[PDB]
Design a binder for these strands. Structure first.
Ligand code: MG
Ligand code: MG
Ligand code: MG
Ligand code: MG
Lengths: 258, 165, 153, 170, 129
RNA sequence: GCGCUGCUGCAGUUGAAACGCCCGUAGUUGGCCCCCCGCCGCCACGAGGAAACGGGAGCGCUCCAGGCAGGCCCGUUGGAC
């Protein structure tokens, strides 16, 4: 029974969707606390070193971050272990590359290059409405951001559009049947579909049923259902519109690419 | 609520020289002859069955064209227990489907009592039930076997057939 | 004879297939019901009542005439005994054996038979206590069996 | 007039209690502010009760009763949360507590057969409920009330005495 | 005491068929017996049969044709997962080409071939070939 | 190996092994019958939940034990399940 909090992370005990190599080393980076937690995030160095290949070692990534060449929602971050999460903005001005962090059909993080018209905001999921000091209403989001004095019409599990420049709401999407959603956890991560039923069980989890555009149907709990607009997506999405292929189709694709 | 009803009512008014009948049902038969079923409400069945044969023969002779049969009207329920949400409600056995069909079969040929029953399961043909009747009656009822089978098939989908033993 | 023996006899009665009354039957359900009243008033067990009806009045099955069994009719008339007849006869036999034994304390076969009868009594009494045919307080004690036998009769 | 009779009955229970000098302390409902009993009019509520939710209804005995129990789920200060279970009563000898019998099945893969097993669960029984041995009860989970008690009775379904003890998984 | 009626019926059937008889009488009829016999008839093993009503555990008469080779039951009705049937087929049947295994499912009494077709499981009743 | 620990799958007249007999609680096992309601078991599917190991798609570390790579015009190359 450890006397205090943990600071290390063994490579084998790291999350699977990070795709770390077994023999790369004994250790893995331990993300620091921030907007996203350990199991729904990814350290900055992994993106800067094992994905874009701009750096070959820890020291290069540290130097780059100190030089303040990377922006995360308009605020330069110098922490090599800063956690990056879903619906983030990842812009590198010195190479005119701007990406949005999303989930692929396989259930992994991806960078979707975006335009300037939609790179000044982000979508947030509201999880809690509480009264703070002096009875002032508040709200919290999945990225650990608190807003004061919100519109009464906003309820839990809704989606919020906040401008990055200032940090103010402009519009919100209600949680209802017939609204396009994206799955952010479980066996169905990265899929896109439309809500068709909402079944609530007293004292336990609420289940959400959605249908894929092709006609497929799948189930998931409400804790990882993310509205990304009405009917049509508000933001850009990867090339494939959240359609998971079968093993046979994936094998055909692999053989074609070989 | 039809035409045969007035004729049967007229006959009933002639016969005596306090009863009432629920309805009338007419079943077709392979031959031009047809069959008519008179629905006697359950409590008065035993009242009608004292002189069933005489009533049937007088009705047949007064009006021809089809034979007359008397059967009671019994309801059927479809749940052994009924869950009201609090207590429990149990279906009496008399309202079961199996009992009702047997009672119907007994009533169709009330004067003669069934001596046996057997259901055959041929290799390919649909199973059929054959009943066994006393040897004494024989030809006394041999002219109503086809109509009896037709009516039993009509009221209940179970097909049947007749023999003597 | 199987529960407390080794015999394998098969003596029983086979009732007819038809449930209808005899053609020569000239009795209604009321007339028979009054006959049970007189027999019951005189203090007769249902089995003997059925014997008498079958022999004297030529009624093979009461059910085929009245549509109900004898004890059901008695209960409808509020004349059925509190203690079922079979258990009462068992207790009578046990009391007789106990009297004969207390007369003489060297017969061991009588003790054997007493053991068997008491076991049967306990089994039947338990079965009747379940199904709510007897008071929950009902209990059989050998010492005071004669007294209750006298009262419960 | 019906409310007036209730208030008088509740008021007497408070004043006859003060005449039970044998008791070491005066037992009261924490929510109600003593002093309302000095009001002649029925302009204030004298008894406190709540609804535990989950579709269960509050017994009339609790609403119209004259008993004090800080561990009761209806008139006390505890909350139901977690697992709801069922069982039969095994013993009712303590002051306000019972022992509940639960039955389940355990499968053995080697022999491809089952075993019958049982566990004992202790619970708190509020005075609003009357229970004998063999009845079926529904228990809800609460915070630790004692060394062995983490459940509270919520519903009682009477069973006839003299009935046969039978293996009844629930 | 009498417990498994189906076992008694099958033993009587095999005993009669051994000495080249033509008709057998089984005493306590039941629905399961009737479905078993229906399946046997459908696969062509025992021709036809009849049920005689006596108001007390009806009897039944069957006609044989000297094709049945062995019939039996599994007393403690174990559960068969939908993917655990081939082991039982190997253990019980002479070959994988002929022979039948009877299962009771939520969809009714059916041959193991049909259950494999629908990819479901259930409880085992018997077998014949 | 060993069906010489036997659930699948041993033996109990003579080789080792049926209590001298009966009653009997706990325990185990209990004929047939109502087509559709409630509950328990059961079957199927699904959600949720670490990897490594094991299975398994693809890749010529010269082969192999292995590892997650490589050439170019790369599924957004891939590391599926
Ligand atoms: Mg015995
Ligand atoms: Mg015998
Ligand atoms: Mg020797
Ligand atoms: Mg020996």
């Amino acid at each position: 029974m450890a006397r205090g909090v943990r600071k290390h992370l063994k490579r084998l005990n790291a999350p699977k969707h990070w795709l770390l190599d077994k023999m790369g080393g004994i250790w893995a980076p331990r993300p620091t606390n921030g907007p996203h937690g350990l199991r729904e995030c990814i350290p900055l160095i992994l993106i800067l070193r094992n994905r874009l290949h701009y750096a070959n070692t820890y020291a290069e990534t540290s130097m780059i971050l100190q030089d303040k060449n990377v922006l995360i929602d308009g605020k330069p971050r110098t922490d090599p272990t800063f956690p990056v999460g879903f619906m983030d903005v990842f812009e590198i001005p010195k190479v005119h590359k701007t990406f949005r962090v999303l989930y692929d059909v396989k259930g992994r993080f991806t960078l979707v290059p975006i335009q300037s018209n939609e790179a000044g905001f982000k979508l947030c999921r509201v999880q809690k409405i509480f009264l703070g000091d002096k009875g002032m209403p508040y709200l919290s989001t999945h990225d650990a951001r608190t807003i004061r004095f919100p519109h009464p019409d906003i309820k839990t599990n809704d989606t919020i559009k906040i401008n990055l420049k200032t940090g103010k709401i402009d519009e919100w999407y209600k949680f209802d049947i017939g609204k396009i959603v994206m799955v952010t956890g479980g066996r169905n991560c990265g899929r896109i579909g439309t809500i068709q039923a909402i079944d609530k069980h007293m004292g336990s989890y609420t289940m959400i049923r959605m249908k894929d555009t092709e006609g497929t149907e799948f189930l998931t709990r409400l804790c990882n259902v993310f509205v990304i607009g009405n009917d049509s997506p508000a933001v850009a999405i990867p090339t494939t519109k959240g359609i998971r292929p079968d093993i046979i189709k994936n094998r055909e694709l692999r053989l074609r690419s070989i | 609520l039809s035409e045969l009803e007035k004729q049967v009512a007229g006959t009933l008014l002639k016969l005596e020289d306090t009863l009432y009948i629920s309805s009338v049902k007419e079943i077709a038969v392979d031959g031009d002859k047809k069959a008519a079923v008179v629905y006697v409400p359950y409590p008065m069945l035993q009242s009608f069955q004292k002189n069933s044969e005489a009533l049937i023969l007088k009705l047949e002779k007064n009006h021809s064209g089809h034979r007359f049969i008397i059967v009671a009207n019994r309801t059927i329920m479809k749940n052994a227990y009924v869950f009201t949400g609090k207590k429990s409600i149990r279906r009496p056995r008399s309202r079961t489907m199996t009992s009702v069909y047997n009672c119907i079969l007994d009533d169709i040929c009330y004067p003669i009592h069934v001596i046996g029953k057997r259901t055959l399961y041929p290799a390919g043909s649909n199973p059929r039930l054959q009943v066994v009747l006393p040897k004494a009656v024989y030809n006394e009822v041999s002219e109503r076997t086809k109509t009896y089978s037709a009516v039993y098939k009509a009221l209940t989908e179970r097909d049947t057939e007749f023999i003597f033993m | 004879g199987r529960m407390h023996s080794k015999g394998k006899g098969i003596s029983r009665s086979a009732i007819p297939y038809t449930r209808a009354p005899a053609p020569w039957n000239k009795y209604t359900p009321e007339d028979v019901c009054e006959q049970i009243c007189k027999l019951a008033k005189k203090g007769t067990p249902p089995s003997r009542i059925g014997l008498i009806l079958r022999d004297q009045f030529a009624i093979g099955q009461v059910k085929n005439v009245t549509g109900s069994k004898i004890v059901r009719i008695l209960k409808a008339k509020g004349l059925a005994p509190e203690i079922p007849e079979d258990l009462y006869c068992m207790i009578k036999k046990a009391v007789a054996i106990r009297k004969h034994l207390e007369r003489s304390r060297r017969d061991k076969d009588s003790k054997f038979r007493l053991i068997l009868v008491e076991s049967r009594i306990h089994r039947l009494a338990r079965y009747y206590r379940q199904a709510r045919r007897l008071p929950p307080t009902f209990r059989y004690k050998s010492d005071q069996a004669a007294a209750l036998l006298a009262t419960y009769a | 007039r019906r409310a007036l009779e209730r208030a008088e009955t509740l008021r007497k229970a408070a004043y006859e209690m003060a005449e039970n000098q044998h008791e070491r302390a005066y037992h009261k409902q924490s929510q109600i502010f003593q002093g309302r009993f000095l009001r002649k009019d029925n302009a204030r509520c004298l008894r406190f009760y709540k609804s535990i939710g989950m579709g269960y209804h509050t017994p009339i005995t609790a609403i119209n009763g004259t008993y004090i129990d800080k561990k009761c789920p209806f008139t006390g200060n505890v909350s139901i949360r977690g697992r709801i279970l069922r069982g039969v009563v095994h013993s009712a000898k303590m002051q306000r507590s019972i022992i509940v019998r639960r039955d389940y099945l355990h499968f053995v893969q080697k022999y491809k057969r089952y075993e019958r097993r049982h566990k004992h669960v202790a619970a708190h029984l509020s005075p609003c409920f009357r229970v004998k041995e063999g009845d079926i009860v529904t228990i809800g989970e609460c915070r630790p009330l004692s060394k062995t008690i983490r459940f509270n009775v919520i519903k009682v379904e009477p069973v006839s005495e003299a009935a046969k003890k039978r293996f009844s998984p629930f | 005491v009498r417990i498994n009626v189906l076992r008694d019926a099958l033993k009587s059937i095999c005993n009669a068929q051994r000495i080249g008889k033509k008709q057998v009488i089984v005493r306590p009829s039941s629905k399961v017996i009737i479905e078993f016999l229906q399946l046997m008839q459908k696969n062509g093993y025992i021709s036809d049969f009849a049920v005689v009503d006596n108001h007390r555990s009806n009897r039944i008469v069957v006609n044989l044709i000297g094709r049945l080779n062995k019939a039996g039951v599994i007393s403690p009705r174990f559960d068969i997962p939908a993917n655990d049937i081939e082991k039982w087929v190997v253990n019980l049947l002479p070959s994988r080409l002929f022979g039948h295994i009877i299962l009771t499912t939520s969809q009714g009494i059916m041959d193991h071939i049909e259950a494999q077709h629908r990819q479901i499981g259930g409880k085992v009743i018997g077998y014949f070939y």
